[PDB]
Nucleic acid binder design. Structure first.
Ligand SMILES: Nc1ncnc2c1ncn2[C@H]1C[C@H](O)[C@@H](COP(=O)(O)OP(=O)(O)OP(=O)(O)O)O1
Ligand SMILES: [Ca+2]
Ligand code: NA
Length: 430
DNA sequence: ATTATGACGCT
DNA sequence: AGCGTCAT
């Protein structure tokens, strides 16, 4: 009844760049603009592995994880840009620096949580309150929402995409109660107005287009963002949840894409998010644990409380390289040489981080995979990180893993290593 | 022979 | 601590 909280207290957005690494390459090389194109890493094995795909190229069926040689079979005119190689490994600096450009623009509008290299959550609750004051009961014009979709509309008693968008928006704005500063739907709408402004600023100042979701929490905002890509934003209201979730596969919701989501489906014998509403909170806790059960009970009702954390910078800085099949490292000299390459890249990034962000890492984590293990990581060990010096870091990393060498022979390494990873963690102000 | 990352949960 | 899950 009146005491039943509905998770409508906040306005949260998720802003995500469209085909991010591709846009970075298209900005730099105008010949790639408005073309089917993809970004690839390495080149020798099957033309390289695709890591980002333009929307033009997606229309041909090109996807992430595809080998470029195979992508070319679907899309013979596909254009490719290659990730830079330094010290024998892929170097993602150009994209990290592009990411910073976007995050700094978003930060002007509100506190953000960096969720990945190309996306951030935004807590707009206070910004919306402020804007509501300026508006002073004045209605919201569709002109302020030129790229916004209202999920679930139009509905009730044109055959073009943009036509439908506008009909939905009109129905939504027709129904709004602008006299109530505390209407959650009004708050979302003003939230969307602000996100239009944020997205315009990002595009003006960087050249990059993005999409966004606006809702009452991070999970719905993320889901919303994906509903209308590219270059559009989507408002998912609390009221839109029952119909949206009624046919929404469980795996689509963030954190349910893996084993947990599979177990929800298997154990409960359901397929869609909305079907979760028929279980009690205790029932869900019984199958999935106290924390997951409570989360599921609220989430299937559109309710989620995870805060937008005030964190714009990554918490760890890492460097990693695989050594698949016949390239696995089988000698001590090999292992030491590659640890050095990784350590040198890591030192470079750490030094820049210290200068830019007034902090120092204090722990070095070393991880390897051995040939045969289905797991991505086989062994992880930490040691102290007291100096930003690659030779020291590489020597220390070797020291902590050297006992893994099954080989009786000193110079040989067995089993061969198929992955090396160095990660700096535990930052302190400096 | 996806690869290169990065955040958070469990015990 | 070291491992596992999920994500981009
Ligand atoms: N599995 C991966 N391996 C390596 N790099 C990845 C992987 N997934 C994503 N990336 C990199 C390249 C992407 O351009 C960037 C952002 O990822 P993501 O947001 O999932 O897709 P995207 O921005 O390329 O397309 P979209 O428009 O669908 O969001 O991060
Ligand atoms: Ca993206
Ligand atoms: Na993303």
């Amino acid at each position: 009844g009146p005491h039943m909280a509905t998770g409508q207290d906040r306005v949260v957005a998720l802003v995500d760049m469209d085909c991010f690494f591709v846009q970075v390459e298209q900005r730099q090389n105008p010949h790639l603009r408005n073309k089917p194109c993809a970004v690839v890493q390495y080149k020798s094995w099957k033309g390289g592995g695709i890591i980002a795909v333009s929307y033009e190229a997606r229309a041909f069926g090109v996807t992430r994880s595809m080998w470029a040689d195979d992508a070319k079979k679907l899309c013979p005119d596909l254009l490719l840009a290659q990730v830079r190689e330094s010290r024998g490994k892929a170097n993602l600096t150009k994209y990290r620096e592009a990411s910073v450009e976007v995050m700094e623009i978003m930060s002007r509008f509100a506190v953000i949580e960096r969720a990945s290299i190309d996306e951030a959550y935004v807590d707009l609750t206070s910004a919306v309150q402020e804007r509501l004051q300026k508006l002073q009961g004045q209605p919201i014009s569709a002109d302020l929402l030129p790229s916004t979709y209202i999920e679930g509309l139009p509905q009730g008693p044109t055959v073009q995409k943009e036509g439908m968008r506008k009909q939905g928006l009109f129905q939504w704005l027709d129904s709004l109660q602008i006299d109530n500063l505390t209407s959650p739907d009004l708050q979302l709408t003003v939230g969307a107005v602000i996100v239009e402004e944020m997205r315009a600023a990002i595009e003006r100042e960087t050249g990059f287009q993005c999409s966004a979701g606006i809702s009452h929490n991070k999970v719905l905002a993320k889901l919303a963002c994906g509903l209308n890509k590219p270059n559009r934003q989507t408002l998912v209201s609390h009221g839109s949840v029952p119909q949206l979730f009624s046919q929404m596969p469980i795996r689509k919701i963030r954190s349910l894409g893996g084993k947990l989501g599979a177990s929800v489906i298997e154990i409960l014998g359901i397929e869609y998010m909305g079907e979760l509403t028929q279980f009690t909170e205790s029932q869900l806790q019984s199958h999935f644990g106290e924390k997951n059960g409570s989360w599921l009970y609220a989430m299937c009702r559109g309710i989620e409380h995870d805060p937008v954390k005030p964190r714009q910078l990554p918490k760890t800085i890492g460097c990693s390289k695989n050594f698949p099949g016949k390239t696995a490292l089988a000698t001590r000299e090999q292992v030491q040489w590659w640890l050095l390459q990784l350590a040198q890249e890591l030192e470079e990034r750490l030094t820049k981080d210290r200068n830019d962000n007034d902090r120092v890492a204090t722990q070095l984590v070393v991880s390897i995979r051995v040939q045969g293990d289905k797991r991505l990581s086989s062994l992880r060990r930490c040691c102290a990180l007291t100096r930003y010096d690659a030779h020291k870091m590489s020597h220390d990393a070797f020291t902590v893993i050297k006992n893994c060498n099954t080989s009786g022979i000193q110079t040989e390494w067995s089993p061969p290593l198929t992955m090396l990873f160095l990660c700096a963690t535990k930052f302190s102000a400096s």
